[PDB]
Design a protein around this ligand. Structure first.
Ligand SMILES: [Mg+2]
Ligand SMILES: [Mg+2]
Ligand SMILES: [Mg+2]
Lengths: 354, 353
């Protein structure tokens, strides 16, 4: 496995896109830009505040980059939620993304977690201090059940980052470890339940569909990301513990086999995703369908994933896949390719300095 | 419907035989010592007026649950201190009192986070009691393990909420069954509560502890799904079970579901030993003891009425009814203990006083 399985990749991707029913939609480039800037502007103002500036140890250049990656992700996948919602979620998911920048052992700051929590004293760990303080702005858009899911998944996430600080791919033969870990820092339930604002949905009325959405969406969302970010992560010696890389270490199988395990779960996930929801409430299947499409557009458009390289390579090849891929790609670009100068400004730093 | 008394025998035999069920840790004297210590502390706790007032539970059931839990803890957390067994017994008794309950959480969970962040007592009486008591359990652990207990308990509360809808998942929702089982499984709570900071160093054994939690989560729940593949059947409140949901969600026969479970269970057991054998001795010990005690407890405890089986095939000359009874015996040798020896006085009696 010296070269990238380009062939195999293009195929799986095209399949994924077909299974999910990837296709044109109602978001218009004008609307995308409207939201991108709204969400970005609110967040940027937030992170530019002195208190946030002070407690969130992050290289500005990176905070800037992360915020933009997150706004884009939210605005493109949470298509049916309100602008405020996109903004508030953008702030939350930007906090979670930023946490992977800390080597700082949580232990000492997590020693009085529960006692402080129960007492109502600000957490020792600055991340929690900021996140928990801001949480209400996200939580207000949801009902009690969904809120609990966001709260849990975020706590889960904090631990997942803790575990990852050990750059540990699992003991050989620890088959349960890889997914255990992936699920932990996957924020699956956060994503899954944040898709159902109480302004547009009734938690109690759609409890079974929402729950089922969360349950299924958790895996789809994470595996689609593991697959998409598999091209950028291929020749990157820095990223040592990914789901695929851990399957290799824990299950004791080849990278190809692991990559195989992933695609099968991903494709199967996609199939059942559509199967279960097609005939369900229209408004639900819509949010679901839009999340998947936007989530894939976002992966395809954001440079972070360097997929444009996969495109420029097979750009001409006359294979069904290669052509099926290139078509889909252009699809995304027509609505997903947007210069940051159109929405992401001014820079967070600039707002912070003022 | 008809209970797979035949199939039930089958699987049970396979596992018991593979994992090699053999509880030889602990002496009956020691078991009774702990049983009564744990029971006594808990019983005094639940008998308190405040607990008596906020925890809506039929006394007869609270009494039964407490005993089921003390036994579970004392028999599986063999290497933890007496206090630890007790405090854990109180925590897991709170969770059990919930596990078999009815009451929409929604209204009381409406200000969960705001109250939490403010430090105001939760609206839901269960949280009000549990969160108040939590420190007694959490003191026995380090920060990492504590986080795992806190998370898994929160997860559990949601799991019970979901179960109140008696929903086995939409047909074709393959991910739903395990999603749910994991939620109300308390896997991480169990898994991390096995490593008291008095006997272990969270930082020194982080990788082993984490791996233990990761693997133990599934073993623990699947072993219970298999063992209780009897008392949860006909039962109404336990209608939506992992196996029963596999049937509804994966659209397969009860046999296929049951077959799937054993495959996971056996494979889990396999890798459990594989990964840990050559690891720190003290770790493999806690792990090995939990598994054995956890199985001893299942064969012996009432709640799982596996008795109405030793005596329903104590005549059937099959090998499934003679492999089942070969163990069911071997177990009650050290695990069969009359409650009159440890569980007294009754919680109610302590409460009335
Ligand atoms: Mg349960
Ligand atoms: Mg069960
Ligand atoms: Mg139960």
């Amino acid at each position: 496995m010296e070269n990238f399985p380009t062939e195999y990749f293009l195929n799986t991707t095209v399949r994924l896109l077909e299974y999910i029913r990837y296709r044109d939609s109602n978001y218009t480039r004008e609307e995308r830009i409207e939201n991108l800037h709204y969400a970005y502007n609110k967040a940027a103002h937030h992170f530019a505040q002195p208190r946030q500036q002070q407690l969130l140890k992050v290289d500005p250049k990176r905070l800037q980059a992360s915020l933009q990656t997150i706004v884009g992700m939210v605005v493109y996948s949470w298509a049916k939620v309100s602008k405020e919602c996109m903004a508030d979620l953008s702030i939350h998911y930007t906090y979670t993304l930023v946490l992977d920048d800390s080597k700082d052992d949580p232990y000492p700051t997590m020693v009085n977690y529960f006692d402080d929590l129960q007492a109502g004293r600000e957490q020792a760990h600055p991340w929690w201090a900021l996140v928990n303080e801001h949480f209400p702005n996200v939580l207000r858009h949801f009902g009690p059940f969904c809120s609990l899911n966001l709260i849990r998944s975020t706590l889960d996430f904090f631990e997942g980052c803790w575990i990852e600080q050990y750059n540990f791919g699992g003991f050989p033969g620890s088959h349960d470890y890889p997914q255990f870990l992936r699920r932990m820092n996957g924020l699956g339930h956060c994503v899954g339940a944040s898709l159902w604002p109480k302004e547009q949905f009734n938690e109690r009325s759609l409890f079974l569909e929402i729950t089922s959405a969360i349950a299924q969406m958790e895996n789809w969302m994470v595996w689609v990301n593991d697959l998409m970010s598999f091209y950028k992560e291929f020749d990157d010696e820095r990223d040592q513990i990914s789901l695929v890389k851990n399957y290799v270490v824990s299950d004791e199988i080849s990278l190809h086999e692991a990559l195989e395990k992933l695609t099968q779960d991903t494709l199967h996930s996609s199939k059942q995703m559509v199967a279960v929801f097609s005939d369900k409430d229209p408004q639900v299947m819509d949010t679901i369908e839009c999340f998947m499409h936007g989530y894939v557009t976002w992966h395809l458009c954001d440079r972070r994933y360097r997929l444009s390289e996969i495109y420029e390579k097979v750009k001409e090849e006359k294979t069904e896949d290669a052509q099926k891929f290139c078509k889909f790609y252009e699809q995304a670009a027509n609505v997903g390719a947007v210069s940051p100068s159109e929405w992401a400004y001014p820079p967070v730093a600039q707002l912070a300095n003022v």
